[PDB]
Scaffold this motif. Structure first.
Motif, mmCIF file in Angstrom:
data_model
loop_
_atom_site.group_PDB
_atom_site.id
_atom_site.type_symbol
_atom_site.label_atom_id
_atom_site.label_comp_id
_atom_site.label_asym_id
_atom_site.label_seq_id
_atom_site.Cartn_x
_atom_site.Cartn_y
_atom_site.Cartn_z
ATOM 1 N N UNK A 20 0.863 -1.173 0.000
ATOM 2 C CA UNK A 20 0.000 0.000 0.000
ATOM 3 C C UNK A 20 0.899 1.224 0.000
ATOM 4 N N UNK A 21 0.913 1.952 -1.111
ATOM 5 C CA UNK A 21 1.816 3.082 -1.251
ATOM 6 C C UNK A 21 1.155 4.165 -2.084
ATOM 7 N N UNK A 22 1.524 5.413 -1.798
ATOM 8 C CA UNK A 22 1.143 6.556 -2.613
ATOM 9 C C UNK A 22 2.278 7.015 -3.524
ATOM 10 N N UNK A 23 3.286 6.170 -3.725
ATOM 11 C CA UNK A 23 4.498 6.500 -4.469
ATOM 12 C C UNK A 23 4.707 5.507 -5.601
#
Lengths: 340, 112, 365
Positions: free
Chosen positions: A60-63
């Motif tokens: 789970x990442x925003x990158x």
């Protein structure tokens, strides 16, 4: 059809969870103040444990911007990715690319392949990326915790059709609670006993993994091991281990509506839970399909059933032997073969 | 509040520390992958304890976090023994680290 | 004769029904704030329940073209089906398909045949479909509920002859309320991105008191006889209300709890005992919330029985608790006509009082 686990444990204040002001969390139950550990804390502690590394296949990442530019090798694809992602719509209200993403660590290769194709139109490249992360769910983490992905329509493309990007959860867990009231320390001028409840839907999990069986058994074993042998934050085996298989969900939290006031807190809590379990069993179910449970204790530290009332199938003295029996009831499932 | 303590007297103390070091900017204390945060913080505090004037006997970390406004805050509690009654008073009501304007330097000593 | 159910049940810290802002529902009763679960949620939970999957004969959908297309086979009907459904007054107000037609008798083969007929696709077909929806649909649960439809003027054609579409529902459910003051609490959470480089949530816990009402004569009338189906509906509703919880936030706040005190009674006029908790229950050190609430309920029920007594109609009721864990008449009173230790035999006894119907045979219809 559902595996139900109830656990009794102790936890020092040095391994607890605190609020925004720095104090451990509390809750009311029966009109008294208790000690509370969030379910999200437990889930995060389990997915990133030492016993669940073999079955962690998602991030789970925003990158994504830094994950995509980690396998191509050629430096000249980064704005390509910051445009394909925004064409998909993974940037939200205000800000820029601030929507959490959840796909397995195997379609990043596909993402790079699609990015590095110069003979493909940008719109259909974004469509290909959508079909890439709309089926990237073959990970045991996704089949135990679920996932939601809302695509913002503020900056959508012409058509860019989205598939089914929502997967239903298979595990239900509860906020952990104190069998008694709050306590303190030694003033100037934590220390608590908690309980636990789990529930796993075998049919839902096997549906979320495209019918795989050995993977589901391995996930069940790993999750039980991690739940038994992991501490929430910081850095202690549970006193009482209960296993049940039912078709409808039943919780036994109304055993501690009467606070336990007293080295015998554990014993009184076990006795109260046993009384509540016996009462529910004898006054809410009969015929149809019976239920069978296993009592496993640390060197049988605490016995259950008024020392005469039978109510569990067998007694287990080792945690490692507990996993095999649970997987045995479904059928076969040797632990040494599903670990491969 | 009039704190009077004799030499060689056991006390119960609570202190929130600021793990601040300078490198080549001010950066938080970092430990190795083979060591626990509590061990690193205990060693770091015991390094400066000679100049402070008290001897550490046991200490465990309670709350390892941050304070915004960005600073690093760690709450350590345990048992300490005063070396001399002269430097202890100077250490008290003065601070044991930086960021003293945001409530990071403060001791609470209790008789045991 | 009215079948009335009173139950008392505790819940784990949970959030079963929330408003638009995510806060669990609340209400004011007796001057103090309580925790609330709405009646529509309870009805939808009973309707969509494992113990009720056998008598679901109703469909309430905004789209019917999809269903008739599925029942048609491999042909195409969507355009002409929409044409007929717009000839009928199924609304176009503010561009929506407003009518959430509660048509029962899920057998849609009649409308499928009408659509797939090479006849005048006009007011004749509109009349036929309107009659089909209005008349035939009865179903078992549209006896407890029912608002068959409400045709729309203006949009509809001027040659339609809609018949009666009111069902006179025979179910009454009261909003659940706790027997104490409500205590809401806030949870703080973080995102914690995995690659290196605060929100707020709400929940509460309470012990609830619930109340249902079933009318025997209206249930029989809406079923056009078939007493076996009426008894089956009574049993299914009893079990569903006894063991089913709202499916809201149960992946994070699992509150699959079961009731501790159940009161079932039969009378000629409906009486509710919600006034027992005008005084909120305050916890003492020697007991719990459940026991005090059950005691206050005992007091109020005994008082009503002694105060509004009539010699021409005795009241017969049954009080059941799991393993008789919490008796009703703790001190001296035998308020209920019978005490029971299991729910299945309670259902059997209720059916026996209704019509002497044993459990096995009514399960066949």
């Amino acid at each position: 059809m559902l595996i139900e686990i109830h656990m009794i444990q102790n936890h020092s204040p040095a391994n607890l969870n605190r609020d925004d002001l720095g104090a451990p969390k509390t809750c009311y139950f029966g009109g008294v103040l208790r000690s509370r550990i969030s379910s999200q804390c437990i889930k995060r502690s389990i997915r990133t444990s030492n016993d669940f590394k073999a079955l962690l296949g998602g991030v789970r990442t925003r990158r994504l911007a830094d994950l995509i530019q980690q396998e191509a090798g050629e430096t000249e694809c980064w704005k390509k990715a910051q445009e394909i992602l925004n064409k998909c719509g993974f940037k939200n209200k205000d800000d820029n690319t601030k929507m959490l993403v959840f796909m397995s660590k195997d379609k990043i290769k596909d993402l790079a392949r699609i990015v590095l194709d110069n003979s493909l139109g940008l719109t259909e490249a974004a469509q290909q990326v959508a079909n890439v992360i709309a089926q990237a769910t073959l990970a045991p983490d996704i089949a135990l915790c679920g996932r939601m992905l809302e695509p913002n329509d503020k900056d959508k493309d012409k058509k860019v059709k989205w598939s089914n990007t929502t997967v239903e959860a298979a595990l239900q867990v509860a906020h952990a609670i104190s069998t008694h009231i709050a306590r303190p320390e030694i003033d100037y001028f934590a220390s608590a006993c908690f309980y636990k409840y789990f529930s796993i839907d075998w049919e839902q999990l096997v549906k979320n993994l495209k019918g795989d069986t050995n993977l589901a058994a391995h996930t069940v074993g790993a999750f039980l091991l991690a739940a038994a042998k992991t501490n929430p934050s910081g850095k202690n085996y549970p006193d009482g281990i209960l296993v049940e298989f039912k078709n409808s969900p039943i919780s036994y939290a109304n055993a501690f509506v009467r606070p336990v006031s007293v080295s015998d807190l554990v014993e009184q809590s076990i006795g109260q839970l046993s009384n509540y379990v016996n009462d529910i069993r004898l006054g809410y179910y009969d015929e149809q399909s019976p239920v069978i449970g296993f009592w496993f204790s640390p060197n049988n530290r605490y016995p259950l059933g008024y020392k005469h009332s039978k109510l569990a199938s067998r007694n287990i003295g080792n945690l490692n032997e507990l996993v095999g029996a649970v997987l045995d009831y479904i059928g076969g499932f040797k632990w040494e073969e599903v670990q491969k | 509040y009039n704190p009077e303590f004799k030499a060689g007297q056991l006390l119960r103390f609570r202190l929130r520390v600021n793990a601040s070091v300078r490198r080549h900017k001010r950066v938080s204390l970092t430990w190795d992958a083979s060591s626990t945060p509590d061990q690193a913080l205990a060693d770091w505090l015991a390094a400066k304890s000679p100049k402070l004037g008290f001897t550490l006997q046991r200490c465990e970390l309670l709350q390892l976090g941050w304070v915004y406004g960005r600073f690093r805050a760690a709450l350590l509690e345990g048992v300490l023994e005063v070396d001399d009654p002269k430097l202890f008073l100077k250490t008290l009501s003065s601070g044991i680290g930086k960021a003293k304007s945001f409530g990071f330097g403060l001791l609470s000593v209790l008789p045991i």
